[PDB]
RNA sequence: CUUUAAAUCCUUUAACGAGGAUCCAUUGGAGGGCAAGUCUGGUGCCAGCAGCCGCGGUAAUUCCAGCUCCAAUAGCGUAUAUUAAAGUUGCUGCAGUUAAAAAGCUCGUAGUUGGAUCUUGGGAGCGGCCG
């Protein structure tokens, strides 16, 4: 008799075939072009895309003019619009299945800060996300696996306590300044 | 070097008179020159090697071994192919396999699953193929689910241009030749099926022989 | 199926029942004879004591002699012939010591070129055999 | 197949047997695009127009092709009804 | 500073805290399945490896060591109970001439299954026969 949670789900799945060529090569290709870390990232994104596709298939297998189907269809369509993967021009229930894994990987905060121009390189982008430097709507973020919503896009900038954002100099710079003042003093 | 015809088919595809191969599959007319495929199907046709299995005899003096080269072929938007060749060594077997795979070419028709939107991506009906003990089934699939099969019919379906299918196999699957021939027979029976779409009673277009006999009676006799 | 009626269930019950007991894996997993014959008593691992070390020969297509340990168990007390796995490890296990006997992989079957032996040794004297092999831990004498 | 845009996505329309209403495939070599000529109306000559027919391999395989060509010629009117 | 019954944990924040970042990432493998050396040394049916096939008999692409390599990565390997793969327990959905499999044959009570047939059609209208 304790008041605990006991709720947990696995976010990744392992494929049936462990050793072959083509899928391993293309996952390595995606990790290379998007600056990810390991295979659990692409396994997680493939699992959540498979869950979205399974929900879309369960919605599509029922008949038209059922209002439960209409409610979950409109809610899921508005969610995929609000993430920013699907466009507002094509908002129908059959366009869910016409999606790829790179569209889900494109809304990553790492790729967004890389393509915004504030980060020079994608490895530098992931480092700078981990480095406590950015802020989104005046709130700093450590985590590169941050799904950015479409409207919270213009409010990405360095934090006020960042040396690149104007403020206190860095620890290495102040150490070298202390050494220079000691040597010249 | 420069290709000279044997039948009148090479003549009619050489003097720029046949528009495409689609009328040749329309008239159910056999193609027995593999370089017509080279002329009309361009660089989109790509090649792969399925399995190199040696077979051997038994005489007084040793076992005379010969290679059996299994090669399928097909451009990624439309047509497929399959070739079985058995020669002495491996290189001539491979070359004969790619020639025979360019010879036996069936086209495939791509259909839809349930909803009818956009470009086709799926087998239009539950087709099947049988040879030996292999039973290869092709079940229509929703969009974007990928190929769900064994590796070599996955290869045949991605060079078929069909992106989304479900399969179900039965029998001694370990024999690659029978399994590949069964999925080739399954994928060849796509047009060999009657659907409500095909209910329009078509008119019979005049044969290319019937309109180019005025040239092939005077060129070659 | 064969009986393809609507108001019939009992014949299909009894037939699927009896033809399921006519299997061999279901008859192994659901009778007390297979559990009684197994010396572990349903356990995955089991501890025993060394009492004599006997080597056994190989099978026909490969010719060698394989060194083995004969172990009397603690929980049951029956004579079971184990097998020390790695190279140069019979000098690590001597008379009257504590060993951890485990299965070898084929669900209680004789495996490979070792006749009549189905169990191996993974731990001796409460220290792992892999660290004794690699030389990272020393056996306490 | 039709489509929502009104554009046929068919790449080639396959022909159909005139006897058993079946479809002749791409790699069937036992099929004939038969052409039958009609007489000129006045005395005996040839006009130039054609009366075309088709048949699949299975009907010739079981051998009922003469019956089918008689029924098709009688339906188009080449052979009289008394026969 | 904060938290809390008072603490520890977390967040915030002074002073410290890196260059060969020694502030050192392991775990099982490299013949086929099964991704990855015909590289270099040693014993050369002994030692051993190997879930299966097999590899060791004096140029071992399978043993024991070095280098290189590949798979996941704060994780990885082994054993046992179980599930999908098993359309090898088959209701969807197995097989019974020769590969495992039709009682020697007939009758017969329980059990299962069971031939046809009993009510049609129209009207005013929504409109240029039918929803």
From Swiss-Prot, chain A:
InterPro entries reported for this sequence: Ribosomal_uS4 (IPR022801), Ribosomal_uS4_CS (IPR018079), Ribosomal_uS4_euk/arc (IPR005710), Ribosomal_uS4_N (IPR001912), S4_RNA-bd (IPR002942), S4_RNA-bd_sf (IPR036986)
Modified residues (Phosphoserine): 152, 162
CDD domains referenced in this protein's UniProt entry, alphabetically: S4
Top-rank lineage group of the source organism: Eukaryota
Domain S4 RNA-binding: 107-181
Family: Belongs to the universal ribosomal protein uS4 family.
GO molecular function term, any single one: rRNA binding
Modified residues (N6-acetyllysine): 65, 115, 154
The keyword Glycoprotein is annotated on this UniProt entry: no
Cross-link (Glycyl lysine isopeptide (Lys-Gly) (interchain with G-Cter in SUMO2)), chain numbering: 92, 138
Disulfide-bond pairs as recorded: none
BP-aspect Gene Ontology terms: ribosomal small subunit biogenesis; translation
Protein name: Small ribosomal subunit protein uS4
Subunit field text: Component of the small ribosomal subunit. Identified in a IGF2BP1-dependent mRNP granule complex containing untranslated mRNAs. Part of the small subunit (SSU) processome, composed of more than 70 proteins and the RNA chaperone small nucleolar RNA (snoRNA) U3.
Membrane-traversing stretches: none
Cellular localisation: Cytoplasm; Nucleus, Nucleolus
UniProtKB/Swiss-Prot annotation, chain C:
Pfam families documented for this protein: Ribosom_S12_S23
Modified residues (3-hydroxyproline): 61
Record key words, sorted: Acetylation, Cytoplasm, Endoplasmic reticulum, Hydroxylation, Isopeptide bond, Nucleus, Ribonucleoprotein, Ribosomal protein, Ubl conjugation
GO cellular component labels: cytosolic ribosome; nucleolus; rough endoplasmic reticulum; small ribosomal subunit
UniProt region (Disordered), positions on chain: 1-25
Chief location bin: cytoplasm
Subcellular location: Cytoplasm, Cytosol; Cytoplasm; Rough endoplasmic reticulum; Nucleus, Nucleolus
Biased composition (Basic residues): 1-19
NCBIfam families xref list: PRK04211.1, uS12_E_A
This protein's name: Small ribosomal subunit protein uS12
Species in which this protein is naturally found: Oryctolagus cuniculus (Rabbit)
UniProtKB/Swiss-Prot annotation, chain D:
Self-association and partners: Component of the 40S small ribosomal subunit.
Pfam families xref list: Ribosomal_S21e
Cell cycle keyword on record: no
Post-translational modification N-acetylmethionine, affected residues: 1
Summary of the function given for this chain in its UniProt record: Component of the small ribosomal subunit. The ribosome is a large ribonucleoprotein complex responsible for the synthesis of proteins in the cell.
Keyword annotations: Acetylation, Cytoplasm, Endoplasmic reticulum, Isopeptide bond, Ribonucleoprotein, Ribosomal protein, Ubl conjugation
Name recorded for this polypeptide: Small ribosomal subunit protein eS21
GO MF term list: structural constituent of ribosome
InterPro entries, alphabetized: Ribosomal_eS21 (IPR001931), Ribosomal_eS21_CS (IPR018279), Ribosomal_eS21_sf (IPR038579)
Subcellular location: Cytoplasm, Cytosol; Cytoplasm; Rough endoplasmic reticulum
PROSITE patterns: RIBOSOMAL_S21E (PS00996)
Domain of life of the source: Eukaryota
Biological process annotations from GO: translation
Entry similarity comment: Belongs to the eukaryotic ribosomal protein eS21 family.
Positions bearing the Glycyl lysine isopeptide (Lys-Gly) (interchain with G-Cter in SUMO2) cross-link: 41
GO cellular component, one term: cytosolic ribosome
């Amino acid at each position: 008799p304790v008041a605990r949670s006991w709720v947990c789900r696995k976010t990744y799945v392992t494929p049936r075939r462990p050793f072959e060529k083509s899928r391993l090569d293309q996952e390595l290709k995606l990790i290379g072009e998007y600056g990810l870390r390991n295979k659990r990232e692409v396994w997680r994104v493939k699992f959540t895309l498979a869950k979205i596709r399974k929900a879309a298939r369960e919605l599509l297998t029922l008949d038209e003019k059922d209002p439960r189907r209409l409610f979950e269809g409109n809610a899921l369509l508005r969610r995929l619009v609000r993430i920013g993967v699907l466009d507002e021009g094509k908002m129908k229930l059959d366009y869910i299945l016409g999606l790829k894994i790179e569209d889900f990987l494109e809304r990553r905060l790492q790729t967004q800060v890389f393509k915004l121009g504030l980060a020079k390189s994608i490895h530098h982008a992931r480092v700078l996300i981990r480095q406590r430097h950015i802020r989104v709507r005046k709130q700093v973020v450590n985590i590169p696996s941050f799904i950015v919503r479409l409207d919270s896009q213009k409010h990405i900038d360095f934090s006020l306590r960042s040396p690149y954002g104007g403020g206190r100099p860095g620890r290495v710079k102040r150490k070298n300044a202390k050494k220079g003042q000691g040597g010249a003093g | 070097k420069e290709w000279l015809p044997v039948t009148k088919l090479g003549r009619l595809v050489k003097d720029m008179k046949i528009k495409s191969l689609e009328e040749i599959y329309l008239f159910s007319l056999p193609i027995k020159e593999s370089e017509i495929i080279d002329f009309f199907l361009g660089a989109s046709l790509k090649d792969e090697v399925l399995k190199i299995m040696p077979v051997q005899k038994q005489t007084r003096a040793g076992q005379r071994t010969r290679f059996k080269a299994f090669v399928a072929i097909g451009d990624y938007n439309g047509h497929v192919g399959l070739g079985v060749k058995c020669s002495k060594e491996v290189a001539t077997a491979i070359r004969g396999a790619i020639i025979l795979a360019k010879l036996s070419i069936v086209p495939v028709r791509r259909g839809y699953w349930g909803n009818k939107i956009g470009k086709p991506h799926t087998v239009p009906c539950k087709v099947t193929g049988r040879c030996g003990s292999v039973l290869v089934r092709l079940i229509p699939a929703p969009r974007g689910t990928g190929i769900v099969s064994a590796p070599v019919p996955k290869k045949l379906l991605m060079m078929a241009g069909i992106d989304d299918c479900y399969t179900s196999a039965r029998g001694c699957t370990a024999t690659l030749g029978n399994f590949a021939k069964a999925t080739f027979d399954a994928i060849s029976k796509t047009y060999s099926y009657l659907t409500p779409d095909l209910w329009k009673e078509t008119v019979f277009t005049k044969s290319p022989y019937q309109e180019f006999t005025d040239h092939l009676v005077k060129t070659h006799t | 199926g064969k009986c393809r009626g609507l108001r019939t269930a009992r014949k299909l019950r009894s037939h699927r029942r009896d033809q399921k007991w006519h299997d061999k894996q279901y008859k192994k997993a659901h009778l007390g004879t297979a559990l009684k014959a197994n010396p572990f008593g349903g356990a995955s691992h089991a501890k025993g004591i060394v009492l004599e070390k006997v080597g056994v020969e190989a099978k026909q297509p490969n010719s060698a002699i394989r060194k083995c340990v004969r172990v009397q168990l603690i929980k049951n007390g029956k004579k079971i012939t184990a097998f020390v796995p790695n190279d140069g490890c019979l000098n690590f296990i001597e008379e009257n010591d504590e060993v951890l006997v485990a299965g070898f992989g084929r669900k209680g079957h004789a495996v490979g070129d070792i006749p009549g032996v189905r169990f191996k040794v993974v731990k001796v004297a409460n220290v792992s055999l892999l660290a004794l092999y690699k030389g990272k831990k020393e056996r306490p004498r | 197949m039709q489509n929502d845009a009104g554009e046929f996505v068919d790449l080639y329309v396959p022909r159909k047997c005139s006897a058993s209403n079946r479809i002749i495939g791409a790699k069937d070599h036992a099929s004939i695009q038969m052409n039958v000529a009609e007489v000129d109306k006045v005395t005996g000559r040839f006009n130039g127009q054609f009366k075309t027919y088709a048949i699949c391999g299975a009907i010739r395989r079981m051998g009922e092709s003469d019956d089918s060509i008689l029924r098709l010629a009688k339906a188009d009117g080449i052979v009289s009804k008394n026969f």
